[PDB]
Design a protein around this ligand. Sequence first.
Ligand SMILES: *[C@@H]1O[C@H](CO)[C@@H](O[C@@H]2O[C@H](CO)[C@@H](O)[C@H](O[C@@H]3O[C@H](CO[C@H]4O[C@H](CO)[C@@H](O)[C@H](O[C@H]5O[C@H](CO)[C@@H](O)[C@H](O)[C@@H]5O)[C@@H]4O)[C@@H](O)[C@H](O[C@H]4O[C@H](CO)[C@@H](O)[C@H](O)[C@@H]4O)[C@@H]3O)[C@H]2NC(C)=O)[C@H](O)[C@H]1NC(C)=O
Ligand SMILES: *[C@@H]1O[C@H](CO)[C@@H](O[C@@H]2O[C@H](CO)[C@@H](O[C@@H]3O[C@H](CO[C@H]4O[C@H](CO)[C@@H](O)[C@H](O[C@H]5O[C@H](CO)[C@@H](O)[C@H](O)[C@@H]5O)[C@@H]4O)[C@@H](O)[C@H](O[C@H]4O[C@H](CO)[C@@H](O)[C@H](O)[C@@H]4O)[C@@H]3O)[C@H](O)[C@H]2NC(C)=O)[C@H](O)[C@H]1NC(C)=O
Ligand SMILES: *[C@@H]1O[C@H](CO)[C@@H](O[C@@H]2O[C@H](CO)[C@@H](O[C@@H]3O[C@H](CO[C@H]4O[C@H](CO)[C@@H](O)[C@H](O[C@H]5O[C@H](CO)[C@@H](O)[C@H](O)[C@@H]5O)[C@@H]4O)[C@@H](O)[C@H](O[C@H]4O[C@H](CO)[C@@H](O)[C@H](O)[C@@H]4O)[C@@H]3O)[C@H](O)[C@H]2NC(C)=O)[C@H](O)[C@H]1NC(C)=O
Ligand SMILES: *[C@@H]1O[C@H](CO)[C@@H](O[C@@H]2O[C@H](CO)[C@@H](O[C@@H]3O[C@H](CO)[C@@H](O)[C@H](O)[C@@H]3O)[C@H](O)[C@H]2NC(C)=O)[C@H](O)[C@H]1NC(C)=O
Ligand SMILES: *[C@@H]1O[C@H](CO)[C@@H](O[C@@H]2O[C@H](CO)[C@@H](O)[C@H](O)[C@H]2NC(C)=O)[C@H](O)[C@H]1NC(C)=O
Ligand SMILES: *[C@@H]1O[C@H](CO[C@@H]2O[C@H](CO)[C@@H](O)[C@H](O)[C@H]2NC(C)=O)[C@@H](O)[C@H](O)[C@H]1NC(C)=O
Ligand code: NAG
Ligand code: ZN
Lengths: 340, 340, 336, 343, 339
Amino acid sequence: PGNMSFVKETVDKLLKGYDIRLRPDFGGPPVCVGMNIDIASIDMVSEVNMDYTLTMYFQQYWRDKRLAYSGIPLNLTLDNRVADQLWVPDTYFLNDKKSFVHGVTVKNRMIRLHPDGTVLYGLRITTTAACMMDLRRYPLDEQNCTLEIESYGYTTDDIEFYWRGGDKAVTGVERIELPQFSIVEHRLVSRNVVFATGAYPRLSLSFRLKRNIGYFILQTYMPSILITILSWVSFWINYDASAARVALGITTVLTMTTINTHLRETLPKIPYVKAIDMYLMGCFVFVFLALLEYAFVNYIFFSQELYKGRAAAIDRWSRIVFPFTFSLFNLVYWLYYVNS
Amino acid sequence: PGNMSFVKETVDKLLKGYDIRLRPDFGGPPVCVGMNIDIASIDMVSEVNMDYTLTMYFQQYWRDKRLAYSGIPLNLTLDNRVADQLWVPDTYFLNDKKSFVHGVTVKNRMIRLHPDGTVLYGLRITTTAACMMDLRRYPLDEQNCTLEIESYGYTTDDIEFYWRGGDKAVTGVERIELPQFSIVEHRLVSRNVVFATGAYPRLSLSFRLKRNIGYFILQTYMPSILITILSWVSFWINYDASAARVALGITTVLTMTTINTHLRETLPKIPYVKAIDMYLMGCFVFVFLALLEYAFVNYIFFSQELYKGRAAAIDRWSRIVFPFTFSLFNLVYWLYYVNS
Amino acid sequence: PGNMSFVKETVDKLLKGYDIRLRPDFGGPPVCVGMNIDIASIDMVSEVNMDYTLTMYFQQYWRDKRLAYSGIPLNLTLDNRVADQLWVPDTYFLNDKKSFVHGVTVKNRMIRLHPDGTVLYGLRITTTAACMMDLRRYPLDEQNCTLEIESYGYTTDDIEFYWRGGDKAVTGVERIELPQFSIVEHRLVSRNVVFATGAYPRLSLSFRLKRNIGYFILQTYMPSILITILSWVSFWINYDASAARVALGITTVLTMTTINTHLRETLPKIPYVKAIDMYLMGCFVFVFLALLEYAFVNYIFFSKGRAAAIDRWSRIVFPFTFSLFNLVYWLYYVNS
Amino acid sequence: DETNDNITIFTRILDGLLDGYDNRLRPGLGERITQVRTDIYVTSFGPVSDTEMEYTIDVFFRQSWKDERLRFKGPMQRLPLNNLLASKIWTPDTFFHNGKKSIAHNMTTPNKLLRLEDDGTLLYTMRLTISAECPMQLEDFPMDAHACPLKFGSYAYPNSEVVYVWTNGSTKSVVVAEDGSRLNQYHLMGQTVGTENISTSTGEYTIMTAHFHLKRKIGYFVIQTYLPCIMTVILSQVSFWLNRESVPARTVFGVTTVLTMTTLSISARNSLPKVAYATAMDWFIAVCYAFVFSALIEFATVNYFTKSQPAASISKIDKMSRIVFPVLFGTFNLVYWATYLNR
Amino acid sequence: NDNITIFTRILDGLLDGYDNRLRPGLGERITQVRTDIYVTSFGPVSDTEMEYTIDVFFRQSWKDERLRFKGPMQRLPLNNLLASKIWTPDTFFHNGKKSIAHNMTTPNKLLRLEDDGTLLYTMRLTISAECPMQLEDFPMDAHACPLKFGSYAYPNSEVVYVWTNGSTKSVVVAEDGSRLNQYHLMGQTVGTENISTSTGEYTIMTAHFHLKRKIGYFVIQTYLPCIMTVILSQVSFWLNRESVPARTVFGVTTVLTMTTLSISARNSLPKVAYATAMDWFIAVCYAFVFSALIEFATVNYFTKSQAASISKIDKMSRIVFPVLFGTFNLVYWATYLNR
Ligand SMILES: *[C@@H]1O[C@H](CO)[C@@H](O[C@@H]2O[C@H](CO)[C@@H](O)[C@H](O[C@@H]3O[C@H](CO[C@H]4O[C@H](CO)[C@@H](O)[C@H](O[C@H]5O[C@H](CO)[C@@H](O)[C@H](O)[C@@H]5O)[C@@H]4O)[C@@H](O)[C@H](O[C@H]4O[C@H](CO)[C@@H](O)[C@H](O)[C@@H]4O)[C@@H]3O)[C@H]2NC(C)=O)[C@H](O)[C@H]1NC(C)=O
Ligand SMILES: *[C@@H]1O[C@H](CO)[C@@H](O[C@@H]2O[C@H](CO)[C@@H](O[C@@H]3O[C@H](CO[C@H]4O[C@H](CO)[C@@H](O)[C@H](O[C@H]5O[C@H](CO)[C@@H](O)[C@H](O)[C@@H]5O)[C@@H]4O)[C@@H](O)[C@H](O[C@H]4O[C@H](CO)[C@@H](O)[C@H](O)[C@@H]4O)[C@@H]3O)[C@H](O)[C@H]2NC(C)=O)[C@H](O)[C@H]1NC(C)=O
Ligand SMILES: *[C@@H]1O[C@H](CO)[C@@H](O[C@@H]2O[C@H](CO)[C@@H](O[C@@H]3O[C@H](CO[C@H]4O[C@H](CO)[C@@H](O)[C@H](O[C@H]5O[C@H](CO)[C@@H](O)[C@H](O)[C@@H]5O)[C@@H]4O)[C@@H](O)[C@H](O[C@H]4O[C@H](CO)[C@@H](O)[C@H](O)[C@@H]4O)[C@@H]3O)[C@H](O)[C@H]2NC(C)=O)[C@H](O)[C@H]1NC(C)=O
Ligand SMILES: *[C@@H]1O[C@H](CO)[C@@H](O[C@@H]2O[C@H](CO)[C@@H](O[C@@H]3O[C@H](CO)[C@@H](O)[C@H](O)[C@@H]3O)[C@H](O)[C@H]2NC(C)=O)[C@H](O)[C@H]1NC(C)=O
Ligand SMILES: *[C@@H]1O[C@H](CO)[C@@H](O[C@@H]2O[C@H](CO)[C@@H](O)[C@H](O)[C@H]2NC(C)=O)[C@H](O)[C@H]1NC(C)=O
Ligand SMILES: *[C@@H]1O[C@H](CO[C@@H]2O[C@H](CO)[C@@H](O)[C@H](O)[C@H]2NC(C)=O)[C@@H](O)[C@H](O)[C@H]1NC(C)=O
Ligand SMILES: *[C@@H]1O[C@H](CO)[C@@H](O)[C@H](O)[C@H]1NC(C)=O
Ligand SMILES: [Zn+2]
């Protein structure tokens, strides 16, 4: 009698005669592995790299009749160094780019056995997962990043996956905030996927991320709007003041160029057209046209009652045509990218 | 007689029959693992990653009667590789992003056995820990970053943590020199996390950080304040000199965006609005309004001696309103983001 | 006939009594380790780190009489994991900072035995080696830095290094091309060194790098030259046009500042003066003097023949002195 | 079926399978060439880095060979092997010649699979991320096309001992996933497959080669570089229609547009890699700077002659430059785009 | 036989009865560990991170009387397969951030044994260590980066460290080892200490490397452009006051130039919380350029907005501004460079 010997010999008896080279219920139906996740945090989302990083407690739960023990009422919690002496599913994350099990102090793993041979195997994992991101609507976009869980060596005839607990098998997603994004929703899916070497079981976890646009309104849209409005000040300065109409114009072009050049150096480098780029180039045209407007007036003023009539008439039209066309442009832009 | 031959067999007869898979007095009351920390440094604090890097000496004390010995007066200190042969608790940090035990020369571990069975197990760890930061007050912000310590596999039915030495359990904080912060205070917390049937022991260590504003005063606020003040010089130049008042206005607009643009290249790149942004855009509006002021003055002067008076009068108002309203805005800014 | 058993018996017969702690011909003459290298590529060269990255197939040859066999008339190639069960020389690259042996599928090692006892031990190594850089002539500079091969534990009385094939012992250097550099030449050296613990054998492999100048001509110098020439346009504008003379002069000062600061941040951070710094600051002075020249003529006018006389001499002096500055500059940093 | 015996013979066969076997030696070392059949399934291609001259590719890498010493006998015609056996069985030392750095994935047990069959054939599959060197020419930077290669073969065993062949034919073996086109800068045209022998100081070897063809997406540079430069040149050229007597105005166009061109030349360098010759974009920016520069020199001569020789015919210069500059810039564009589009 | 078999049977005769868990002389005596360092390379110094990298051959020697042996050879090199079965001290670097023990073509480790039982343990390390910096005087500052190391487990009562020669001949820097870009390395200091920690009292070895920054780069890059931009913004006092647009364009643009100079200057430094000597200079220069345009505003007001105009301001600022800037320049350099 006594725990120190009774338990010690029990664990030795279980492993004595065990074979990790052979899956539970071999020859019989597939071993059904139940899975659940507790998401500690979403570290970052990288559009330039097209990936995101998780930290999570990944748990697996299956039955192995070879590990049945009797007499002991406790759910035996063994040292994490025993996990290398037992059969565990060869699960892997399909879209993983780089991941590792945390190891400080001691390797972050756990195995709990129960009298009826059912095994609980837990890990704490940090994984960087690839995510397809469509930035054509950036920064007004939303993204559907996913985590794919699949069995490597075994087809669906040997391994079966299921979300333990159903739709509530993933938790902690409701406890997470990100600087740039906010999780609209998350979905759980289970599938059987057939490809070159057999039908495979797969579990999928998906997050819908909606970007926060307040940052860009303050830094990109309003600056362009105000600099564009300063361009219209030219039409209100008397056309005889050439040195004033000009310095306002070309400097606005330089002001707009500085904004466009350095914004795309600070914000992530994504070399294809985006919604923010269509706006900034759209403004560059308005600043462009507001200065060709004077050049047309100056030539008409000096070179060709027309000298005072046409020169003042063009300004009089430009004072309403330019503001109206910019209002129309914004209306089309916003109702396109936001409401369409 | 009392030579190392006696010690050799003494240590061996402790390890013979010793089982690492079973915690001290398995099946008995919990293990009281006392902990102690000596902070070496805080290598980094970064807003872009919302994390800080910490290096520390982490000690854990527990009593394991299986290692009791008699006849040797000394507090035996053994080669650190004995750690692979003894039972050690599975403590881990909840919020660490990446951690490692130092390995130079030989892994920075320690074990010292005392006659009554007490084990002192310590190791030098560098850990990057997650700390969500409220940057809404960026230059004038304050942070409470914490280190959370928890047991991975064992509930409070098996392991109980406590700070060894109470409030004196953590040392070295007074000797830290952060570049942009200062440690206001630190507090030690011991608690039992409880959910479902499993109560989990946890210890946590918190630092309160206050940012030093000196950098931002000289290179962010004053450069913007003097540019804003400088734009008001246009109100004192005679309104007939359109080429001059316009040059002063649009160029100060170019300077404001130049300052804002390259601050964006040097401040942390966190996509959400902050206190620093509200000021730079506050100034950018005043500089923008300073140039709209002439647009009205110049138009009124030429779009006519009553209108000589109106053009002059608008200046006399603007030389009063602009200094007053900017100071009013300045005063409100240094109260909302001070009282909050 | 049952050869697979015959070869297994032979290979095991080699390992009988083999001690990893004993070198070949122990106690007797030194073991001669011939070496050979194939440069896969010369990777990024960085001034900010004063090091360069190199990938190579490093190979070593030696005879171990314990490993000779007569039954099998073949050069036996053995699995990669046999290298941990044989004596291999204690070689190391003295000037390396970080390096690793490739492990894409299995660790990239090679063990090949020959009947006469010669052992060929090959490794595929990527190594970052310290490269002492003297950038005072940057970007007109040549750079010489080496890969330094030495033994750690054994002095020259126990081990000897030599190149296999003399000057032919290194290949791949005649085919690699870098973006910023071109390989002028490489040299192989073998010598003995006296060191704090004893006399040691060493091999040295050296590359001579000449920087490609075509990038800085278009992107750094010509933009500076055009702005400097553009500043002399001020001397042709009539001196009574104060608002135009100042706007031209002061803006060329601003655009010089723009290029200097944005070249400072994009180019590698090397906090000591270099050739471009002496050129960029030289142009800044000429642009500064062109504006200071107007303030001089304006003062004489507003106080005229002398005002025009100043305006006319500067039209020849500025182009002349800048050409002299270029002649002194290019002559100095090309020839001396 | 036959449960208790089915498990018994499985472990009985697999445990005794490794007796009389030396994993340090090839199958048929002294008798036959060890033929290895290979295949690849590309889970993802990219990203591609121009500054580092590299690209990243994710692959399930398959290898198959027949080992006569592992011919087991039993009811099951195929027999999965546990990784304990995989580390004690001879496997080819295949390596990638282009690999800067590679990861053999190791998460939640290793991502390796080894199957054995009745006739001794081995199927060895394992998941990789390969960062491979891609030397690329850049004279056509914004409009160039590339073919980044992937090359692999045995490390130690020469051509006379091990040979590699594509398992299901050259172009019928490699497969790219539909989602696998994970590129942002480029658009993948396709891929081609082949093999060749090589020679080295240590002997001959057989390489397996697969090229992935890329074409750059031009859309970004049109809105980023070409247009701002084209518009900026149009600004410098409109200054000729202003009156000659507005000297302060004419001046600031010429100098400010030069400053605008200076800013637009900063971003080009950051988008470029560090190569040391003029790319097709550098031709454009250099010529645009020439037009902007020469426009202000045009004013300088007009200013001088109208001030030093006033009733002079100096106005001719404005009337000539008004047509010359737009037309000559136009023919440069037609030459430029014709040179590189029809290429 | 007599030169080959003897050697191997001596090694196998050392370890039977040995115990690598116990230091030599558990209760009998203190273990003396003699150490010395050869710095192959020093630098870079990452002042933006307050750390520096040093590459050293680190050597340690001690006597283990259990390995005392007798034979024809006075000493013999062991091999790393045997070094792991022998006790070695738990030396570590107190201020090390991240260190590499080089593992390339077998470990870069050496262990030799004399017949007296003395052991010489050598290994090549690349150490990145902390070096806190007082960047108040940034452009013309100096530092003393330390390297502190000692035993991790065994306290002063059990293991003590002594420099091999107990003198200057204990830390050696290679003639070509100074791989420093922006610092000079004038000298070194070698010391020793005792400290007390929660786990006991420990003895420490310390080595300090004294560094001095290169002034040249910052003079050409920051001080000269700032000075010239301030010599400008003062030549306008000799421009005719009547041409208002020329004076205004001149002054506002030089304020922008100083803004660009100030923007680029902060590219350096680790972004510390207090004003360095750069901020003393740049901030005051921005004041002179700022006040140089407020000077125009007041003199413009009293001629275009009076004519009984005032010419004092323009004629006096030609003296006052150059004098004030000259006095500031002289005081600034007299303060920081005489340090
Ligand atoms: C950085 O952030 C932290 C989190 O914002 C700041 O506050 C700490 O946060 C921790 C959680 O991380 C929090 O527990 C802690 O509060 C003190 O905790 C002490 C431990 O008490 C525990 O055991 C009690 C058992 O009876 C239990 O009641 C305590 O709280 C629980 O029960 C109560 C009552 O039902 C609930 O309201 C509560 O929600 C919990 O469920 C807890 O589990 C405790 O000492 C202290 O106050 C109690 O005890 C005192 C002494 O007995 C009494 O005098 C007092 O009246 C209370 O009963 C707190 O509850 C705080 N820590 C502090 C000091 O506030 C960190 O402070 C911050 N760090 C920095 C540096 O700024
Ligand atoms: C991010 O983007 C991903 C990828 O687009 C999104 O993932 C998709 O989510 C949807 C739900 O929103 C998933 O649809 C559900 O899928 C399951 C499983 O069905 C699959 O597996 C079955 C078992 O093997 C199999 O029978 C199914 O077979 C289909 O096809 C056959 C014909 O070949 C047909 O006979 C079957 O009827 C099926 O159509 C299939 O392989 C399934 O449980 C769901 O169906 C239930 O719910 C629907 C709700 O309308 C209901 O109508 C049904 O009656 C049933 O009750 C449902 O189809 C989809 O599989 C996911 N796609 C992929 C590729 O994984 C993800 O949602 C996005 N994230 C976010 C946050 O938006
Ligand atoms: C980059 O920069 C590095 C560092 O400067 C360059 O490396 C140097 O390269 C040169 C060659 O370009 C090396 O010198 C050569 O060394 C050998 C070997 O000489 C040694 O070994 C001999 C035995 O093999 C031994 O006899 C020599 O002893 C004599 O010389 C020494 C020194 O003068 C003297 O003290 C003794 O008394 C002896 O007189 C010595 O130990 C040598 O072969 C070379 O030429 C000599 O020898 C040949 C005959 O073999 C003869 O024909 C020549 O005329 C000449 O006498 C030559 O000296 C030098 O050692 C390298 N330096 C270092 C520090 O490594 C590197 O080349 C640069 N790169 C590039 C790409 O250029
Ligand atoms: C990858 O995952 C493995 C498995 O979880 C990690 O641990 C390694 O596991 C292998 C066996 O799979 C250990 O190999 C050992 O080798 C010898 C020879 O076969 C034998 O004595 C043992 O039975 C054992 O199999 C290996 O030591 C072990 N490594 C560590 C560090 O614990 C592995 O760390 C993960 N990472 C990598 C890069 O492999
Ligand atoms: C690569 O080398 C192999 C060596 O075996 C070549 O295969 C031989 O090809 C010749 C004709 O060139 C045949 O006559 C031989 O029978 C082949 N040998 C075997 C063993 O089949 C192969 O052709 C070479 N491939 C290339 C592309 O050069
Ligand atoms: C560190 O402490 C040691 C302690 O050594 C003892 O020193 C006393 C005083 O000199 C001497 O009487 C004892 O015999 C010594 N004991 C032993 C066992 O050696 C000092 O000697 C050192 O000087 C101290 N170091 C410093 C830097 O202060
Ligand atoms: C060090 O080299 C030895 C040589 O046997 C090897 O076994 C060991 O794994 C290496 N260690 C590291 C960390 O590379
Ligand atoms: Zn900039």
